[PDB]
Amino acid sequence: GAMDGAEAVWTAYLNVSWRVPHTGVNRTVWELSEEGVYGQDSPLEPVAGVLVPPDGPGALNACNPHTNFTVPTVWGSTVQVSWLALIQRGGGCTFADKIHLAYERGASGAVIFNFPGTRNEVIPMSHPGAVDIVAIMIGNLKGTKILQSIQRGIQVTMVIEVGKKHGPWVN
Amino acid sequence: GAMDGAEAVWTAYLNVSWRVPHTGVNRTVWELSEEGVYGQDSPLEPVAGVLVPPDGPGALNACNPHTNFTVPTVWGSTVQVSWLALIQRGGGCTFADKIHLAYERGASGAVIFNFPGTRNEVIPMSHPGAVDIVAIMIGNLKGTKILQSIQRGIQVTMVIEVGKKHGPWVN
Ligand SMILES: *[C@@H]1O[C@H](CO)[C@@H](O)[C@H](O)[C@H]1NC(C)=O
Numbered sequence A, B: 001g002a003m004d005g006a007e008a009v010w011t012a013y014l015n016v017s018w019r020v021p022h023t024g025v026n027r028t029v030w031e032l033s034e035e036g037v038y039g040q041d042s043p044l045e046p047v048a049g050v051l052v053p054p055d056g057p058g059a060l061n062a063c064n065p066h067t068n069f070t071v072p073t074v075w076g077s078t079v080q081v082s083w084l085a086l087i088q089r090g091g092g093c094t095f096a097d098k099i100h101l102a103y104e105r106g107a108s109g110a111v112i113f114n115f116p117g118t119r120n121e122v123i124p125m126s127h128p129g130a131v132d133i134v135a136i137m138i139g140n141l142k143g144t145k146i147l148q149s150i151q152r153g154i155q156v157t158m159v160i161e162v163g164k165k166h167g168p169w170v171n
């Protein structure tokens, strides 16, 4: 019938910032919200970084274990800035596959977004084989909005923080 | 939005038998069904016994830690037959409280039934402090039907078996 609240699910607070060009030197649009949920096997801790999707048409699912990301570097070196992999759900591979790849590429967290037609729906992720970095899910609409901004050359930064506990049913 | 499939939830197969009087020597009505779910912290194993609710008006919640049960015995001794405590959800105490009491009274399992107005709805139970015996939840309507039969002097026996796994979301 309804198998919700079997285990605690923790929401995430997201503070998302867009680097808007051409309207004045410091201008950023930012949205603070409680959307997204930490994966069930995620470290429960904050993380922040520049959002980076997989390269190329159409590798958005990061199923291919040789999937590449184009990651910004620190001025004057080859060292990566702190970054979060932005990866679409689906494509025939697991949450653990996507989250593990993110970690192996040096990402500080993995932001999985739900697939087309699910709107703003988020679900809990099970990924006990991939626990090294923060992993959250966000909705399709928010993920798409972010991905399109990035594809249009806008840098998008996200700070993720531990949100609120939902469940389990104790009475 | 919808926090279902965070952790595997296992259904139970129930084989419930009523000892019907006055229609012939062996007559039993029995219903076999997949309803009910094992608690999240229940042993995942079969159990069988006579169903026994708490004594008295209206101790159906078994909140009182001195709650009593009237348990049938083996012919000629004081040894209890195998039995399952039939306990209503609610009353201001936890699933663990009810399940722990059942164990302390010698029950081989605890069958929690959902409260009035929930119809046939069952939810997962969290009870990590009470893991000694099989614990399941069944719906209000089935629990009420069983309780009333017992109150009307009909012995009701239940065999509980491991059912089917639902969740968690891996992709
Ligand atoms: C991934 O990135 C590098 C580019 O040199 C390479 O290892 C591999 O061939 C690339 N292509 C794909 C489709 O993953």
Ligand SMILES: *[C@@H]1O[C@H](CO)[C@@H](O)[C@H](O)[C@H]1NC(C)=O
Residues within 6 Å of the ligand: B056, B064, B066, B067, B068
């Ligand atoms: C419970 O059962 C026995 C009956 O002698 C006793 O320990 C206790 O007073 C009883 N009453 C209630 C309401 O639990």
